[PDB]
Every structure is written in structure tokens, then in C-alpha cells.
Design a protein around this ligand. Structure first.
Ligand SMILES: CCCCCCCC/C=C\CCCCCCCC(=O)O[C@H](COC(=O)CCCCCCCCCCCCCCC)COP(=O)([O-])OCC[N+](C)(C)C
Ligand SMILES: CCCCCCCC/C=C\CCCCCCCC(=O)O[C@H](COC(=O)CCCCCCCCCCCCCCC)COP(=O)([O-])OCC[N+](C)(C)C
Ligand SMILES: CCCCCCCC/C=C\CCCCCCCC(=O)O[C@H](COC(=O)CCCCCCCCCCCCCCC)COP(=O)([O-])OCC[N+](C)(C)C
Ligand SMILES: CCCCCCCC/C=C\CCCCCCCC(=O)O[C@H](COC(=O)CCCCCCCCCCCCCCC)COP(=O)([O-])OCC[N+](C)(C)C
Ligand SMILES: CCCCCCCC/C=C\CCCCCCCC(=O)O[C@H](COC(=O)CCCCCCCCCCCCCCC)COP(=O)(O)OCCN
Ligand SMILES: CCCCCCCC/C=C\CCCCCCCC(=O)O[C@H](COC(=O)CCCCCCCCCCCCCCC)COP(=O)(O)OCCN
Ligand SMILES: CCCCCCCC/C=C\CCCCCCCC(=O)O[C@H](COC(=O)CCCCCCCCCCCCCCC)COP(=O)(O)OCCN
Ligand SMILES: CCCCCCCC/C=C\CCCCCCCC(=O)O[C@H](COC(=O)CCCCCCCCCCCCCCC)COP(=O)(O)OCCN
Ligand SMILES: CCCCCCCC/C=C\CCCCCCCC(=O)O[C@H](COC(=O)CCCCCCCCCCCCCCC)COP(=O)(O)OCCN
Ligand SMILES: CCCCCCCC/C=C\CCCCCCCC(=O)O[C@H](COC(=O)CCCCCCCCCCCCCCC)COP(=O)(O)OCCN
Ligand SMILES: CCCCCCCC/C=C\CCCCCCCC(=O)O[C@H](COC(=O)CCCCCCCCCCCCCCC)COP(=O)(O)OCCN
Ligand SMILES: CCCCCCCC/C=C\CCCCCCCC(=O)O[C@H](COC(=O)CCCCCCCCCCCCCCC)COP(=O)(O)OCCN
Lengths: 429, 267
């Protein structure tokens, strides 16, 4: 299609073409009745036996890195119309389906004291029925949300066909739903309180850790999560150097400092050196005051181990992590403004494939009218409250020089023809 | 139009709170409310004086960098809230018998204090474990190692990288920003002056003596005070002139062949 070819090859002509789809009313910004009109006849499907994915021109602009065309106001109003059509509704539905399981477990935690067992009748201590209705409704909501998650994931097992294995969000959801089921089960089957609160800890922790993955779809929140992913994978890659260096210092401090309680076991010494990584060395408690009481076996080697540990782990390794973090964040923020709109257009073109086609005909609109002086009204007010080039130059240079040398070659051939056909009298010999 | 401005809000807080701090010369007020207002009044006076420091040249760029990093932290605060709420509710569950985690809100504030690296490993994790006072000890040490990996190492270095990027972005254009703020200050202050004063104080030419230092007031003021794109563009202009002249020359040579006389070279 010619629009995709203009996006791929000559984007400035596509900008000129998009400039025609901006109809100004009277060129007076002070007028309350002033408006502008956006037409979307070039952004639509090329048909309007092969099939096309939705948002053809937008995917072509994203895949060709034409970020100056994504920031064009026709494209911005096209994404805004596409959002207010169905995307906000589907996104709030998807978020509420998880938040319906998120909220009552947090209420159930912050009301009931940990350690105690509780049925649907109340808190077993002797028992009370003060807020038993709220506890019962919260356990019913968490149980129904968990079995709905089981049904959805059991559908996605047969839908994915052994392709969901290399995904951490599915693993987190299995942990959340199983652990919340075991936390809720004392309304049916009696379970001791130790296992119940052991599961309540893990369930609340992984609920609020998994909600960050639902935060990826926003524009003002996704880039922090992307940077978090990059730095966490880099730490994952450095963990073996972490393990061997920390194991060196842990076994060494297990040997030299044996009589002290923080280094009694080798595993406790490993965890103590991991706590000492950040700089909480405890110099006076572990090294100085045992030395002044003659309680250090091998004191000279102990202070040498202290100065070697303080040089290696909290200074060198931590600044290595800081430098890796600065490099990775600079790498991500080099391409952030394209990444935001790319995630938005990927969200819209992934959600639009599953919608029914009559709904897609009914909600679609080919042109919009914006009044700049009149603010949008209630729901839109609440939404506004909650919301708050040298390579191509040398390439053109090279094209013009190639045209120049072609014309000069033709001219040289014509001059040789002149010498071949010229008449020479009184200049011979 | 003054609604979307934080300096006006700070000034409302300062003047109301200072009025309530001063009022016991007129109307008797208990000392609790009086010193409660004195705290807030002194704090916001000295926080607001930084905004008055923006108009200097040697001081404004630090305030601009402070604005940029503080707005970036404002943008990251929701990830802060959810991550810290995860760890706060978790340590409220597993560490219940200890005084720093008695309430859920106290556990939230304790994890916020543990953000920087003041973990208190020996007081909260080790010595209760050696006295058999930890319910769920294995899960507690797993929560400890997970917290120490996530919050003080990963999130703080994320803040450091964002800070380095923002400060590099600001100091890329600092020398223009200083003189731009100065000329904006002068062109904003000059609009409100009376025009006869602007005629009287203006001067069309100055004389500077480099060898003689300026005198007293000026001495106290001196004591208190202490390109490849255009090249290729010109390249492109010269090449366009070159190809225009060569086009004219080619047309002249075709005219030569059109008007040339050929004898004894035909056929
Ligand atoms: C709710 C309002 C969110 C609307 C919105 O998009 O705003 C988001 C902040 O809102 C959040 O990201 C906060 C969400 C946290 C809620 C959890 C609490 C549960 C207990 C920011 O808005 P956005 O997503 O940039 O949408 C802008 C509209 N276009 C550009 C996409 C057209
Ligand atoms: C002595 C000891 C020394 C040891 C040193 C060890 C040092 C090693 C340190 C760290 C390595 C371990 C990191 C594990 C996860 C990293 C990969 C990952 O999730 O990235 C990506 C998302 O991730 C993100 O970008 C968001 C981040 C939020 C996820 C947090 C949950 C983790 C809780 C665990 C805590 C367990 C503790 C439990 C205890 C009770 C997922 O990968 P992807 O497929 O690219 O993206 C798909 C994303 N969608 C499409 C699915 C949405
Ligand atoms: C007073 C001297 C300031 C003069 C000046 O401009 O110097 C400022 C430092 O001075 C300060 O910024 C310190 C201000 C703090 C005083 C608060 C104390 C109250 C208790 C620095 O001087 P400046 O503003 O660069 O002016 C240079 C003159 N041109 C370039 C503008 C022509
Ligand atoms: C568990 C908890 C977890 C929570 C995590 C939370 C993390 C979130 C962290 C931070 C977000 C909160 C930041 C609030 C202000 C940021 C915007 C701002 O002022 O920037 C700009 C100026 O600002 C500057 O550049 C100078 C900076 C000085 C101002 C300090 C006063 C703040 C005192 C509050 C303390 C309250 C405490 C009181 C208690 C007693 C103003 O914006 P502007 O209009 O662009 O510029 C106009 C400037 N002129 C023209 C007017 C001059
Ligand atoms: C998300 C929006 C849902 C907010 C409604 C939660 C109210 C439940 C509740 O018990 O709140 C009050 C208790 O508050 C809490 O314990 C913590 C509330 C935090 C809920 C946030 C999720 C009722 O207390 P009482 O019955 O007087 O004793
Ligand atoms: C790969 C290289 C890592 C190898 C280092 C691990 C050594 C730690 C270790 O084994 O300590 C022994 C093992 O302790 C455990 O219970 C599990 C230890 C696993 C720690 C591994 C974590 C390293 C990172 C402690 O001795 P004990 O259990 O008291 O034995 C009693 C006998 N009657
Ligand atoms: C490139 C890597 C090189 C690593 C070099 C390791 C440096 C180790 C530490 C150096 C500390 C600097 C100053 C220490 C001088 C103190 C002299 C001294 O007698 O201290 C004594 C020092 O003890 C030691 O460290 C001796 C080490 C014995 C290990 C022998 C194995 C060496 C074999 C290497 C062969 C290499 C061949 C190359 C040619 C402490 O005695 P104590 O019995 O604890 O008495 C305590 C009474 N209150
Ligand atoms: C490397 C060169 C190190 C230079 C100087 C420190 C060497 C000290 C060894 C023994 C000297 C005397 C001594 O016992 O030190 C006592 C203990 O102090 C120490 O153990 C100092 C040990 C520091 C070793 C640092 C060298 C390791 C560097 C490796 C870094 C690799 C990366 C304290 O002195 P005092 O209480 O005045 O003496 C009372 C009765 N002796
Ligand atoms: C809970 C509070 C966290 C809310 C901050 C999240 C993002 C809002 C945001 O950055 O809005 C931007 C910042 O809004 C402001 O004007 C200053 C916000 C500071 C509010 C702190 C007061 C809390 C008490 C507005 O965009 P712009 O400055 O025109 O560029
Ligand atoms: C990608 C995210 C994956 C997250 C993985 C979470 C890792 C959690 C922690 C691991 C620690 C590594 C080594 C621990 C081994 C210790 C063995 C053990 O018996 O410890 C016990 C460990 O307890 C636990 O953590 C068990 C957890 C029960 C939750 C069950 C829910 C699991 C369901 C998941 C379903 C997923 C399906 C996927 C296919 C402590 O027992 P105690 O009763 O406190 O006795 C204390 C007496 N002094
Ligand atoms: C991941 C693989 C972790 C490897 C090794 C640690 C697993 C330890 C589980 C239980 C082993 C024995 C034990 O109770 O450990 C005791 C308690 O220590 C612990 O609780 C260690 C727990 C460390 C869990 C670390 C794994 C979580 C990593 C997730 C990070 C995600 C980001 C101390 O040993 P002891 O006093 O010698 O034993 C006396 C009587 N048992
Ligand atoms: C209260 C003290 C803080 C005063 C420093 C504020 C700015 C003064 C400043 O940077 O002057 C610059 C630094 O002045 C100096 O020569 C060194 C100043 C160090 C003074 C520290 C002594 C305090 C006792 C002068 O400009 P330049 O070095 O020619 O380039």
C-alpha cells in the first residue's frame, strides 16, 4: 500500500500528507466556539483473500522508528480516540478483576492479628463475632477470585499448548492462587494457624509484587518497570561472582571468628557477610572490643581480613553495580519516547484482535472534533485529575554528487564528439 | 490563574502558621498549638528561601537540578509505594512479636527506614533466632535476603542512574540557562518600571578602566561575589551552486554541437 511505502521511504512527504488532515475553524484561539477537526482516512485499513492486522500505519511507523510522525497531533488524537473507545474500559476491567482478589486479603490481614486462627464464625482464641461478616465476605471474595484464576489458567493451558512454560508471570500467578487458597481454606477444612499464616505471608507478598506487572500498561509507570527489569537481569548475570566472592569471605570469617555468635555456623557466617556487604561492618562490636579483651584468636590476620573485606566488597563491588546501573539506565532512556508509544500501540493492536467485529464497527469513528477553549466535562475531569540527523544529510550529499558525476560523464562524451567532428583548416601539422 | 503554583501554597502556609505562632500577644492560645505552628512555620520559611535563591547566577543551577531530580522521584513514587507496601506487610506478618513491627503502619515506616541500608540484622533477625523467638525463621531469612537484594541495592542504584542522567541533561545546557534566567529577570522587571525612571537611569555607552579597580560598595560586591552541521550545510550550498553552473555549461555545449560547421567529417 502507498501509505506504508511513504512511511518506510519518504516520511517527510507523509508528514505533509498528515498536515492536510487538520481543519481549522477560524484561526482564533480566543473563541469559545473555535474547534479543529482531525480526519483519519489515511490511518485506516488499506481495504477501507488476505488479512491485515489492525493499526497498519501505526505499526509501520513504529517498526521504522519514525518518532516524529508518532508525535504528530493527528496520530496523538488517533491514539486518544482509540483509548477512549475501548482501551480504558478493557484496562479497568482487567485491573478490577485482579484488584477484587487483591483488596480483601489486605483487609483480612490488617484486621486479624497474625498467629491467630479464624473460621468464618470469627477469630479463634474463646472467640468473637464483632466483624465476622466482613471476614466472611473477604474470605468468600478471595476464594472465588482464586478459583476464577484457576479456571482462567486452566483455559490458558489448553490455549497456549505448552508454550506458557518460559514465563514468570504464570509462575507468580500459580503461587498466588495456590497460597491464597490455603490461606482461605479454614472456612471449609480445619487447618492449624502456623501453616495458615505461613501461607498468608507468601500470598500477600506475591500479590503486591505481581501488581507491578499490571502497572506496565500505563504510560507514566511502564518505563520504571522496564529499567527495573534491565537492572535485575544484569544482577542475575552477576550473581555467580557474588556467590563465589561472598563464599570466600564467609568461610574466612567462619574460620577466624569462631567464638562470636554471628559466626557460629558457616551458613550464619555467609548470611552475616551478605549483611556486611552494604557497609554495616560492626567494627567495634566484632573486631575492636574482642581485641581489647584478648578474645580474638589470630588478631593480626583478623584485621587483615577486615581491611581486605572492606576494600573488596562494599567499595569495589558496589561501585561496579552502580556503574552497571548507570550504563543500563542510559541505554534505556536513549530510546524511551519511542518505547512508550510502542507499548501503547502494541496494547491496542493486541486487544483489538480479540474484539468482535460488529463492536469494532460500532465504536469506530472516522473523524474527531476538538474544542480547545471548552474543557471536557465529571468523568473527563476525574480522568484529568488522575492523569496529573547528519546521516540523511550526507546521504542526500552523496545522491547529488552521483547525479553530478553522471551529467559530467555525458558532457565529456559530447566534448569528445566535438573534437571528433570539428573542422581544422590553417591549424594543421 | 495562581492555582497551579506551589510557591503560593507555601506562602499561604507560612503566613497563616506564623500568624498562629505570633497570636498570643493578642489572644491567649495554649502552648501546644503555638509550638506545633512554630515548627511548621520555621521549616517552611527556610524551605521557601531556596526559591528566592533562584535569581542568582552562582546558585540557580543547583535549584534547577534539584527540581528535575525531585520531579523524577515524584514520578517514581507509585513503584515506591507498592514495593514498600509489599515488604512492609510481609515483615508485619513474619515479625510480629518485635516492637518495631507491632502495627502495620509502624512496619511500613520501619521498612522505609530500612530502605537506605540500616537493616538491623543482629537486633531483629539474628538474636531472636538464637533465642528461638522467630516464628517461621527460614522464611524470615528468605525475606531478609530478598529485601536486601531488591530495595537497597536495585532501587537505590536505579535512583542513582536516574540522577546521573538528569544532571547530565541539565548541565548539557547550563551556560545558556544562566544568562537566559538573567535576561528573563531583567525583561520581566523592566516592564513594571515607570517610563521616566527608565529614561533617567538608562545609559547608551560605558567606559571601563581595566587598570583602576572599582571602589567600598564595589569592593564589598566583589568580596561577596567571590559545529559540524553548518559545515555540511555550507558544503551542500556550494555543491548546489556547482551543479547549477554545470547544467548551464552542458546546455551551452549542446548549443555548440547544434551550431557547429562540419565539412570533411560527414558520414
Ligand atoms: C485509577 C486512575 C488511573 C487512570 C490512568 O490511566 O492514570 C495513569 C496513572 O494512574 C496509575 O497508573 C495509578 C494506578 C494505581 C491504582 C491501584 C489502587 C488499588 C488499591 C496515567 O495515565 P496514562 O495511562 O498515561 O493515560 C493517558 C491517556 N492516553 C495517553 C493513554 C491516551
Ligand atoms: C547469600 C545469598 C546471595 C544470593 C545473590 C542472588 C542475586 C541474584 C538476583 C536476582 C535474580 C532474581 C530475579 C527474578 C526475576 C527477574 C526476571 C523478571 O521477572 O523480569 C521480567 C519482568 O520483570 C520486570 O521487569 C518487573 C519486576 C517485578 C518482578 C518481581 C518478582 C520477583 C520475586 C522473587 C522473590 C523470591 C523470594 C521469596 C522468599 C519468600 C520477566 O521476564 P520476561 O519474560 O522478559 O518479561 C515478560 C513480562 N510479561 C509479558 C510477562 C508481563
Ligand atoms: C548579600 C550579597 C549577595 C550579592 C550577590 O549577587 O552575590 C551572589 C552570591 O550571594 C548569594 O547568593 C548569597 C545570598 C544569601 C544571603 C541570605 C542571608 C540572610 C540571613 C553571587 O553574585 P551574582 O548574583 O552572580 O551577580 C553577579 C553580577 N551579574 C553577573 C548578575 C551582573
Ligand atoms: C512511606 C512513605 C513513602 C512516600 C514516598 C514519597 C516520594 C515522593 C517524593 C517527592 C514528591 C514531592 C515534592 C513536592 C515539590 C516538588 C515540585 C516543586 O516544588 O518544584 C518546582 C520548584 O521547586 C524547586 O525546583 C525548588 C525545590 C524546593 C521546594 C521544597 C518544598 C517542599 C516541602 C514539602 C514537605 C512536606 C512535609 C511536611 C511535614 C511537616 C515547582 O514547580 P514549577 O511550577 O515547575 O516551578 C515554578 C517555580 N517558581 C516560578 C514558582 C519560582
Ligand atoms: C479499594 C477500596 C476499598 C476500601 C474499603 C475498606 C473498608 C473495610 C474496613 O474494615 O475498614 C475499617 C478497618 O480499616 C482497616 O483495618 C484497614 C483498611 C484498609 C483498606 C484498603 C484496601 C472498618 O473498621 P471497624 O469495622 O470500625 O472495626
Ligand atoms: C557451589 C558452591 C557453594 C558451597 C558452599 C556451601 C556450604 C555450607 C554447608 O554445607 O553448611 C552445612 C549445611 O547447612 C545447611 O543446612 C544447608 C546449607 C546450604 C547453603 C548454600 C548457600 C550458598 C550461597 C551446615 O552444617 P550442619 O547442617 O550443622 O551439619 C551437621 C552434621 N552433623
Ligand atoms: C598477591 C597476594 C599476596 C597476599 C599477601 C598476604 C598478606 C597477609 C597479611 C599481612 C599483614 C602485614 C603485617 C603483618 C606482620 C606481623 C608479624 C607477625 O608475627 O604476625 C603473625 C602473622 O602470621 C601470619 O600471617 C603468618 C602466615 C603463615 C602462612 C605461611 C604460608 C606462606 C607460603 C607462601 C609461599 C610463596 C612462595 C613465593 C616465593 C601473627 O602471629 P600470632 O601467632 O597470631 O601471634 C599473636 C600474638 N598476639
Ligand atoms: C601491608 C603493610 C601493613 C602495615 C602496617 C601494619 C602491620 C601490623 C602487624 C603487627 C604490628 C603490631 C601489632 O600487633 O599491631 C596490633 C594489631 O593491629 C593489626 O592487626 C594491624 C593489621 C593490619 C594489616 C593490613 C595489611 C593488609 C592489606 C591487604 C589489602 C589487599 C587488598 C595493634 O597495635 P598495638 O596494639 O600498638 O600493639 C600492642 C602490642 N603488639
Ligand atoms: C501520592 C503523590 C504522588 C503523585 C505524583 C505522580 C505523577 C504526577 C506528576 O508528575 O504531575 C506533574 C507534577 O505536578 C506538579 O505540578 C507538582 C506535584 C507535587 C505534589 C506533591 C504534594 C503531596 C503532599 C504535572 O506535570 P508538569 O509539572 O506540568 O510537567
Ligand atoms: C520466580 C519466583 C520463585 C519464588 C521461590 C520462593 C523461594 C522460597 C524460599 C526458599 C529457601 C531455600 C531453602 C529452604 C529449604 C528448607 C526446608 C524446610 O523444611 O523449611 C521450611 C520451609 O517452609 C516453606 O517455605 C514452605 C512453603 C509452603 C507454601 C506452599 C505453596 C506452594 C505452591 C506453588 C505452586 C506452583 C506450581 C508450579 C508447578 C520451614 O519450615 P518451619 O515449619 O518453619 O520449621 C522451623 C523449625 N525450626
Ligand atoms: C536458593 C537456595 C538456598 C540455599 C541454601 C539455604 C537453605 C536453608 C534452609 C534450611 C537448612 C538448615 C537450616 O535450618 O538453616 C538455618 C536457618 O538459615 C536460614 O534460614 C537460611 C535461609 C536462606 C534462604 C535464601 C534463599 C532465598 C533467595 C531469594 C532471592 C530472590 C531475589 C541455619 O542453619 P544451622 O543453624 O546450621 O541449623 C541448625 C538446625 N537446623
Ligand atoms: C561559608 C563558605 C562557603 C563559600 C563558597 C561559595 C562560592 C565561592 C567560590 O567558589 O569562589 C571560588 C573559590 O575560591 C577559592 O579560591 C577557594 C575557596 C575555599 C574557602 C574555604 C574556607 C572556609 C573556612 C573563586 O573562584 P576561582 O577559584 O577563581 O574559579
Amino acid at each position: 500500500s502507498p501509505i506504508t511505502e511513504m512511511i518506510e521511504y519518504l516520511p517527510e512527504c507523509m508528514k505533509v500528507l498528515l498536515d492536510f488532515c487538520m481543519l481549522h475553524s477560524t484561526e482564533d484561539k480566543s473563541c469559545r466556539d473555535y474547534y479543529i477537526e482531525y480526519n483519519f482516512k489515511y490511518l485506516q485499513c488499506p481495504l477501507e483473500d488476505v488479512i491485515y492486522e489492525p493499526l497498519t500505519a501505526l505499526n509501520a511507523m513504529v517498526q521504522n522508528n519514525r518518532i516524529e510522525l508518532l508525535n504528530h497531533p493527528v496520530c496523538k488524537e488517533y491514539l486518544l480516540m482509540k483509548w477512549l473507545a475501548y482501551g480504558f474500559r478493557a484496562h479497568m476491567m482487567n485491573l478490577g478483576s485482579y484488584c477484587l482478589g487483591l483488596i480483601p486479603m489486605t483487609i483480612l490481614v490488617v484486621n486479624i492479628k497474625p498467629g491467630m486462627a479464624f473460621n468464618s464464625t470469627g477469630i479463634i482464641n474463646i472467640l468473637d463475632t464483632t466483624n465476622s461478616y466482613l471476614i466472611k465476605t473477604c474470605m468468600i471474595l478471595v476464594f472465588l477470585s482464586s478459583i476464577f484464576g484457576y479456571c482462567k489458567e486452566a483455559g490458558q493451558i489448553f490455549q497456549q499448548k505448552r508454550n506458557y512454560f518460559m514465563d514468570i508471570s504464570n509462575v507468580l500467578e500459580w503461587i498466588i492462587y495456590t497460597t491464597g487458597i490455603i490461606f482461605v481454606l479454614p472456612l471449609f477444612v480445619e487447618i492449624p494457624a502456623h501453616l495458615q499464616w505461613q501461607c498468608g505471608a507468601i500470598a500477600v507478598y506475591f500479590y503486591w509484587m505481581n501488581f507491578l506487572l499490571y502497572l506496565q500498561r500505563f504510560e507514566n509507570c511502564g518505563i520504571f518497570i522496564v529499567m527495573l527489569e534491565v537492572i535485575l537481569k544484569t544482577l542475575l548475570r552477576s550473581t555467580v561472582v557474588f556467590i563465589f566472592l561472598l563464599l570466600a569471605f564467609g568461610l574466612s570469617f567462619y574460620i577466624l571468628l569462631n567464638l562470636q555468635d554471628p559466626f557460629s555456623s558457616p551458613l550464619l557466617s555467609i548470611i552475616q557477610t551478605f549483611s556486611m556487604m552494604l557497609g554495616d561492618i560492626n567494627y567495634r562490636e566484632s573486631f575492636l572490643e574482642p581485641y581489647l579483651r584478648n578474645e580474638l584468636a589470630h588478631p593480626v590476620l583478623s584485621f587483615a581480613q577486615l581491611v581486605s573485606f572492606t576494600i573488596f566488597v562494599p567499595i569495589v563491588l558496589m561501585n561496579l553495580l552502580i556503574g552497571l546501573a548507570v550504563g543500563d539506565i542510559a541505554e534505556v532512556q536513549k530510546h524511551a519516547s519511542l518505547k512508550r508509544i510502542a507499548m501503547q500501540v502494541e496494547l491496542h493492536t493486541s486487544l483489538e484482535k480479540k474484539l468482535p467485529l460488529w463492536f469494532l464497527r460500532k465504536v469506530d469513528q472516522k473523524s474527531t472534533i476538538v474544542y480547545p477553549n471548552k474543557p471536557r466535562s465529571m468523568l473527563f475531569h476525574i480522568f484529568c485529575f488522575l492523569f496529573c540527523s547528519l546521516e540523511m544529510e550526507i546521504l542526500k550529499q552523496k545522491y547529488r554528487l552521483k547525479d553530478l558525476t553522471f551529467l559530467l560523464e555525458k558532457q565529456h562524451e559530447l566534448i569528445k564528439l566535438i573534437i571528433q567532428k570539428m573542422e581544422i583548416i590553417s591549424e594543421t601539422e
